[PDB]
UniProtKB/Swiss-Prot annotation, chain B:
GO terms for cellular component: cell surface; endosome membrane; external side of plasma membrane; filopodium membrane; lamellipodium membrane; plasma membrane. Glycosylated. Glycosylation is essential for Seneca Valley virus (SVV) attachment and entry. The gene is ANTXR1. This is Anthrax toxin receptor 1. Plays a role in cell attachment and migration. Interacts with extracellular matrix proteins and with the actin cytoskeleton and thereby plays an important role in normal extracellular matrix (ECM) homeostasis. Mediates adhesion of cells to type 1 collagen and gelatin, reorganization of the actin cytoskeleton and promotes cell spreading. Plays a role in the angiogenic response of cultured umbilical vein endothelial cells. May also act as a receptor for PLAU. Upon ligand binding, stimulates the phosphorylation of EGFR and ERK1/2. (Microbial infection) Acts as a receptor for protective antigen (PA) of B.anthracis. Residues 119-125 are annotated as: Interaction with PA. Its main location: membrane. Disulfide bonds join C4-C185. It comes from Homo sapiens (Human). One of its GO terms (biological process) is negative regulation of extracellular matrix assembly. Residues 3-185 are extracellular. Residues 9-180 form the VWFA domain. A divalent metal cation binds at S17, S19, T83. The chain holds residues 38 to 220 of 564 of the full protein.
Amino acid sequence: STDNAETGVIEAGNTDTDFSGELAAPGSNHTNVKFLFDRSRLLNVIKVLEKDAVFPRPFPTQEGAQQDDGYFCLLTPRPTVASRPATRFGLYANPSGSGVLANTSLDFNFYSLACFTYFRSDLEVTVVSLEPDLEFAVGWFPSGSEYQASSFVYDQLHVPFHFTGRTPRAFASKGGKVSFVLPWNSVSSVLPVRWGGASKLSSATRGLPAHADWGTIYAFVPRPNEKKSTAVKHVAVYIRYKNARAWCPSMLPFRSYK
Amino acid sequence: SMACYGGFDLYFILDKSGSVLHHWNEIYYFVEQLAHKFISPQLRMSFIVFSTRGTTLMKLTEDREQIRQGLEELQKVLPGGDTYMHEGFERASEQIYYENRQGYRTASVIIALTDGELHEDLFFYSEREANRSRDLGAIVYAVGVKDFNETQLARIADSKDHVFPVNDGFQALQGIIHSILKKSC
Amino acid sequence: PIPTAPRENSLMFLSTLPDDTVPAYGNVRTPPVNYLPGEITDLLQLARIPTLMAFERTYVPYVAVPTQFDDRPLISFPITLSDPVYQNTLVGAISSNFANYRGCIQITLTFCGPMMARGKFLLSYSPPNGTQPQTLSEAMQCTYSIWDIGLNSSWTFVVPYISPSDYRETRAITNSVYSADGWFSLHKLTKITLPPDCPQSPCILFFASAGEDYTLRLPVDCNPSYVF
Amino acid sequence: PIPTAPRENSLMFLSTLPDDTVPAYGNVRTPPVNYLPGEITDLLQLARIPTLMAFERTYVPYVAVPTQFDDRPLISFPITLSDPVYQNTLVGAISSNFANYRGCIQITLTFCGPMMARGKFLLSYSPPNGTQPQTLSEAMQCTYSIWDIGLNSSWTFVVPYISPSDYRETRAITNSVYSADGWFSLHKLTKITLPPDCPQSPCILFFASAGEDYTLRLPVDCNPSYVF
Amino acid sequence: FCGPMMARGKFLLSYSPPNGTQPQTLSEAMQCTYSIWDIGLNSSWTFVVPYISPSDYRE
Amino acid sequence: DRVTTQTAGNTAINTQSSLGVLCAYVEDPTKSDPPSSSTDQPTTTFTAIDRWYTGRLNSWTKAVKTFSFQAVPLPGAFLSRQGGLNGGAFTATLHRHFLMKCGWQVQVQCNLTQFHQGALLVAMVPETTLDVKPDGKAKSLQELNEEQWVEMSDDYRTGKNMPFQSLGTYYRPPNWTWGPNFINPYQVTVFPHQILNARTSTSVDINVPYIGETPTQSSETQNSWTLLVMVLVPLDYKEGATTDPEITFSVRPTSPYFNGLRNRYTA
Amino acid sequence: RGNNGNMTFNYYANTYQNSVDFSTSGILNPLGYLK
Ligand SMILES: [Mg+2]
């Protein structure tokens, strides 16, 4: 069918448009955005806390900072680094040495189907243990709050301040899991998948949204600091995007030909 | 020392960052003419590239079939990326540490092609990894391409006079490489 | 108490369970998104947008038309949505995240040459044969459509859905030998007769959109090799 | 028995679960509290009551007005509810126990000087700029309101809610550089012309109340450093 | 435009009101009363110089 | 049929090979309601900012390869004055209002002849940092006027070189491989686009509404759209023809809603 | 409705399970209109 594609709008035609044929039946609705993003996937593998940690200091962190890394899961499909929102995703090709290997995360299953710019949904976090018989718990603090980092001596036991709070501290059973659904808490109307504005928190980094997150979870162990174990235990954070809505179509990542 | 080195080794740790996209043939012709002028069997040379991934593009070898093919792979290099010179030195420090397992006394020389304009938080790591090659008995020369930073190379190199620009330090490295080949066995 | 006998799949975390879970921090009034225009209701609003293909010349969205006559297709690529001419199209990069498809791929062309370039082009679609068709007398017998160059500058050849099954596979895993659903092939019919002082080798810019009946099924895990 | 399949979050004590639990010792008729007057229905009945601020002079709820002219704000403090002029106000000490706020801070003044003290004061509110405004010609352009001293002795400057988000943060955690929602700044416009035999340096007593639309959200754990 | 028929081009007519300095840059007739004239099938443009004056009858 | 004169305020622009206004995401992108995140009375449009602001863009030689793009930040071009795109009464109002909520309406003119071939892909690209150097600094006019067309490397196709927070000396600096502000150059036609072909038109017409993560964004930080001119087919001509055709662009802000009046922005 | 097969019974309410927007005051339409 004779067209002009310089116009920018092409009417999607069928076989009957040029030839003799008919329309096929509608297959299914598995491309529905509220249906397609509504399934769980691995987000980040964070180490389980055992003491009242220091939250990671803001960038640029200098050496001699006695902070606690690899502990907080900033719940976001966008690339993160050191439990803080980043712009580039970077893994370690040859991690020999040298400093602190920063925990990065990315939602691999999201950006392959995030052909849009803005995305709003609830979040259903399931925190699966990666340790046999682990009796852990799961904190949370919203987009814009900060970690309460101290302890209080309860009967000569340094019970930390992340055992309590007005935010959900879900306690897992022995060998169980933690599953709860978090609302869209951030101050932005939508989470920018791609962002081009500047956040003026620092020397203004272009393309870094400051409040594109559902918060930040952290696993801990419900014992005081005297009962701190030795081997560092992990946990695995599965998230699901409940009630997904997506705006403003955009690009999919570049599949290299090599 | 007075004892001759059993093997004289050479490291072309080459910068292929996004900032040397306009000066890559100047870098390559500095390596095309220091690999052809030295075809001696006592010299082993390696071609290390770095922009973001520090990459051993050719291992430390002396068979001249490979060095002919090593330069014909540096010509197929497109620059682009950040400037991770701390990983340019980790690909050599994994090869000085291997050649110390042979048990010889080897004078491994590091030639560091660079643009000099390093980030402030990467110069801490590039100096820290250079000092781990100066713990392993290597000598680091920073071949400066057009405009660079001397003070950002006075700590990568051994002193402020080991830094050479590329138009002056072509023959000046021939006065150092061939100086030690007579000092070798 | 109500006597319940819980099933064998108790305490099983399932990633794609069609159900909700316990709310933790409810009664949150989100700020309204009524101001945002252009909501994606469904990702088949985006397979229908024609995106550029890429051709082994070094990957180029257009086909150069060399002036030398030879009896073979000018460009030829199979109709298989794992073929590397579809990797960076929204037809291909959405459907490679799925397992099946159904409907008509729509190949839009665009003659980006000069305005004075007259010519005719015989698009085609062979169904999967034992041998890929090469002669212009072999794409004459398949599903062809002659495209003249004139005032307008685009032709949308609709690759039909001829299949022995209601949902074709979206990835040539095993085997389809080089023959899954056959081959598109742009033959040139008459040579492009250019007036004097005009550029040789004009460029046919290819697109790839989905039909109005192109429908996808069965999400799978994606390929995370875009991030490496 | 009813076959139930219990979920993955079974036997989880959650501190903020919106539900009841099993009663242990019920059927207790409590004595009636109908005699007590003044029940707090809601804690925004108490942010609206103006309480005294405190100023780095040694912390003083009033601003002394020195008689020497200088072109800078007499007192200047940012509109951020983690700033240490708000720690001992019911606007600040209730909102620091929360995570967000929305609405208008209301700064009530009170001229506690002599009755014969005539003068004029240019209150202001800059939105967050790159530089804090200092000149009287720079608070003239912001949201100002001139306050004359006369028979009445109070002015309630209502700090507006100008924000790019429906709920501002209530604590300057990271970063807001010294600039979160801008700065209140009481400039003096004309010098206070006192008659003879009257005290120099009269005192403007500052309050800080919440607006009729000031609303709070998201409780957090408090700061227990009041008990140390 | 009395040129050939195949001559494509565009022309930015203008009208500055009386300034202290005559405008010269294309970025200075962009701000005055301009009107872009394309050359095509038709071959005439009638730029109407407005009547902007502090008096009802100019000299 | 194809002769459309688009009068706006006191600046009417003309096009005699018009393909049609590509109204994006809605029927009428001019219609917009005031921001819900400002309790003060917003400064609406007025008759000195409802006009066609026009500035040049770089020439298009034969040396320009496929996919070599050229990006215009909106409203980033009114403030840095890229291409001579001086806002005038709009930039002098944009500097004094803290938040700004507008939708754009662009038009790119590049008149080829009937003996030239080539095709641009003019596309209002939302939310990209294509104007920023990888080291964080935004480009200046001395830096744009030396590369002339920012070529599509693999750092742009992967998003390897988008601006970032340096982690510091504490963390080991990781090998960056990807960032979401990439360009997939084969999929830029999903954006509101027209193809500026050398045989169908001289000017393209795109009309986009306000989009953004907030109901209104800041004035000095936002890059919610990006007028992206991408070369899909390289320019070719026989010798004697008019070398290096000019590219201009004409930008009109449709219904802006300024908020938060303060003095002129001094960084 | 999404990927929700529990057609019958919602235990928690709307504002607890979901997160509704606060007020201020199929048919696949195209994402770009030629006008
Ligand atoms: Mg570099």
